[PDB]
Symmetry: C9
Subunit: 86 residues, 9 copies
């Protein structure tokens, strides 16, 4: 008739999922930008020895992107396999 | 007009979609500004390093913008193909 | 009492506000950070001025793209709400 | 009697409007502070050639303040000419 | 006591007003601290530049505080003269 | 069931929390940033100490003004709620 | 039977209290980290004269922690002595 | 199943608890990263200052982590011993 | 209609989302800031490399601890909700 329990649960899941991905993008965009800031400046300062900067950059971006995609996976769980759905 | 389940689900979807895109823009705006800060500073320090520095700059911006547009895709999923709609 | 669109529209306005609120945080801070580098760059090399304009405009262009794309979707949310009944 | 549709829409509009102006002030306060940080430091470093810093500062503040006031305009739309009001 | 439309509108106004002032303080506190960071650093670097540096400092703080107090004015509008009150 | 003031008071407490939450973010980070400059300034010039106190106190004064003005309005929101029925 | 007024007020109080402490920890963690960043760097640069850094550090941390604990006190008021409870 | 007061109180507690821990992690992650930035930079600048620099680093991390775990304690209070439960 | 657990579970999912949203903000920015120092440190002293690994890993370890402890409590919130009726 009117509302049912899953309408409220699903609304909660979509808001929760949004928080997860919203936070993920804040962390990833700013974290990657900060890492890349050092890469750009390091290459500017030391063009001949820049190769040694790339594994540290990719380790850093790897960590940052792992947070983004682990969050993405839990957003997908929230909205496609909602825990507590009735 | 009686409330119905999709009214609540759609309200949650729009809020969730807003969180996704709001966070996306925070990460992209600040991440791109931080990347650009190093680009601008590097060119100011060494004029002829301009070509050299656009390469790590675009790698960084690529990473930052990937977050923005993956978030955009999921906002679109939330509001145009809402998971859990009844 | 209430009707379905009252709830949907309330959600759209909150969603729209999140979109624009986040857009201004990203654009204001991103542009400030870009301009910080422009100002410092010019102070360091008073006639580096000319060569700094292109990277400043590219950076601001990217930052402003996020603001404007968000603005467009806020407009969609509140003027053509997806899911309106 | 009890609630009416516009009570809920208007509550949404006020919360939305608050998000718009809250975010606008975060972006403007921090963005202007960051721009002014460079202005202060530049004037400290180069008092004789500081005049060339002011158009770049005002362009930057112009961009930052434009975000604040465009947001202000949409807050005013949300709360004084609410889209979707019944 | 039955709920009434203004109860919901006023709740939205208070939340909206809180967002406005919460964001205002984030922008003002951090923006002023960032401006002051350059002032303090500049005086440490060159003692007799103190007078010189307060001028761009107060221009910056003026901009930052304008955001805070314009936000304050609209919080006051929201909670004392609520747009849309029935 | 419910009554009008239950909803208004719930909104006031959420609004009050936003005010103080934002106030502490601004004050904690703003003060930390001001103190960062004070500490670095003293480390650079160990007897610049005296001349740094005034600009530090002016900066902290401004930051703390935002915290305290927010505190006052949180108090208004929760102890004298505007719009209470 | 169903809901009562204090259920809604108490839910508001817990959310409000959460906002207070959530914001308090953001301000304290980042503020202390920023202060400590300068302490670490200052001690690195000037090991012999580092003692003069500690009162400025503790004044700064004092200010930052005061925001955290004043917020904590108001969270405690919100959730243990809720203003407006019926 | 009819709604009951504790359903609403517990929902508020979980949201409040989430705000507490969400803010705790923002402050701790960023505060610790900022502290570590000075540690790493200081060791890079002067290798044998390593021992010296861990002392102010752990003082800083102690302060930052205190915020995280005091917040954790109050999240636990909110969700396991909810103040105001009926 | 509704039942008590619909409201509790909706709160748990929102709470869980706040926990993980905040966790990723802290971890992404904290790790980026740590890596920024690692990259700059190596660029300054190309064979400082070895001695920078330990402080980098300690910093990342602390940052990641916040992410993981948050993850565990999100899991508690949504898979074993405290207060479920
Ligand atoms: C760097 O990795 C770590 N460091 C830690 C440091 C301290 C503590 Br106390 C916990 C830590 C835990 C971990 C991981 C881990 C490894 C194994 C099991 C559980 C957790 C991690 O949490 C990292 C997530 N980061 C990158 C945002 C993780 C979580 C979830 C899914 C993952 C998938 C793939 C890889 C890592 C995954
Ligand atoms: C710098 O300006 C831009 N750069 C962009 C860069 C990339 C992309 Br893809 C879009 C961009 C769009 C714009 C503007 C624009 C110009 C014309 C039409 C539409 C949009 C803008 O969005 C800027 C807002 N900023 C400052 C926060 C704008 C929006 C709304 C109202 C405005 C009023 C006055 C001035 C600008 C106004
Ligand atoms: C530095 O202290 C200040 N500077 C200001 C600067 C400008 C303005 Br306009 C107001 C200012 C107000 C104050 C304090 C104050 C002193 C006396 C009375 C009222 C307020 C303060 O607000 C500081 C909180 N900070 C540290 C987050 C405070 C509030 C509440 C409880 C406190 C308990 C103990 C100490 C300070 C306490
Ligand atoms: C915590 C950061 C660890 C980064 C990896 C450091 C160990 C590998 O270091 C790598 O050594 C190679 C040769 O062996 C070089 O060609 C690479 O430039 C360098 O990154
Ligand atoms: C984010 C994508 C938009 C980029 C548009 C401008 C691309 C500029 O591209 C860059 O131009 C420089 C000169 O300005 C050259 O020196 C560089 O080699 C080139 O990469
Ligand atoms: C994407 C483009 C963003 C531009 C931001 C608006 C400010 C325009 O900046 C203009 O740039 C010119 C280039 O020579 C300068 O000479 C002008 O003085 C300046 O007004
Ligand atoms: C992108 C934001 C500006 C363009 C908004 C989309 C077009 C506006 O759409 C119009 O808005 C009017 C009020 O302005 C309403 O009264 C009308 O019903 C509506 O058609
Ligand atoms: C800025 C780019 C995206 C803007 C999308 C806005 C779509 C607005 O769409 C408009 O909605 C109005 C009612 O609000 C109607 O009167 C118009 O017929 C309709 O075209
Ligand atoms: C993107 C930033 C563009 C800033 C404007 C640069 C072009 C104008 O530059 C201006 O030239 C004047 C004389 O012509 C000088 O008196 C000013 O100091 C200088 O700002
Ligand atoms: C934000 C407004 C509050 C400011 C109060 C203090 C004003 C200080 O004013 C400044 O004092 C300096 C010495 O301390 C002088 O050298 C400067 O010329 C003067 O501008
Ligand atoms: C707006 C004022 C903010 C002050 C913050 C509280 C710390 C007071 O700081 C005091 O400043 C004195 C000035 O000489 C120092 O000598 C004292 O050691 C110090 O305790
Ligand atoms: C600015 C924050 C501190 C001052 C709060 C405003 C005055 C407090 O007001 C009092 O609060 C009491 C609990 O403390 C309530 O029990 C009383 O009903 C109320 O009169
Ligand atoms: C800190 C500056 C602004 C504080 C505004 C607080 C106003 C509190 O006002 C007080 O409310 C109490 C009930 O809570 C009543 O008992 C008192 O009569 C009333 O004066
Ligand atoms: C605003 C910052 C004020 C910090 C306090 C400065 C005044 C006291 O300064 C203190 O003087 C002592 C001897 O008198 C020294 O032993 C301490 O190292 C020094 O901090
Ligand atoms: C946050 C607590 C976890 C810390 C675990 C590692 C502790 C490292 O401890 C440090 O090790 C250094 C060499 O690496 C020594 O030079 C320092 O004296 C010592 O403090
Ligand atoms: C708490 C530990 C966090 C580690 C982050 C994952 C990256 C591991 O980094 C590894 O460190 C090694 C140390 O010598 C390097 O030699 C390897 O090249 C590198 O892959
Ligand atoms: C820490 C996050 C990963 C571990 C999650 C806790 C264990 C999962 O728990 C299981 O989740 C399933 C879906 O994955 C549900 O279908 C099951 O009902 C539930 O038992
Ligand atoms: C990651 C460390 C904390 C994880 C806490 C997760 C507790 C999950 O607990 C599990 O919940 C499932 C239903 O969701 C049940 O099927 C299982 O019986 C139960 O053990």
């Amino acid at each position: 008739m009117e509302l049912d329990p899953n309408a409220l649960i699903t609304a909660g899941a979509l808001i929760g999922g949004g928080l997860i991905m919203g936070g993920g993008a804040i962390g990833a965009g700013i974290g990657d930008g900060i890492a890349g800031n050092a890469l750009i400046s390091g290459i500017a300062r030391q063009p001949e020895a820049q190769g040694r900067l790339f594994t540290p950059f990719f380790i850093t971006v790897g960590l940052v992107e792992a947070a983004y995609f682990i969050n993405l996976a839990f957003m997908a769980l929230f909205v496609f396999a909602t825990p507590g759905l009735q």
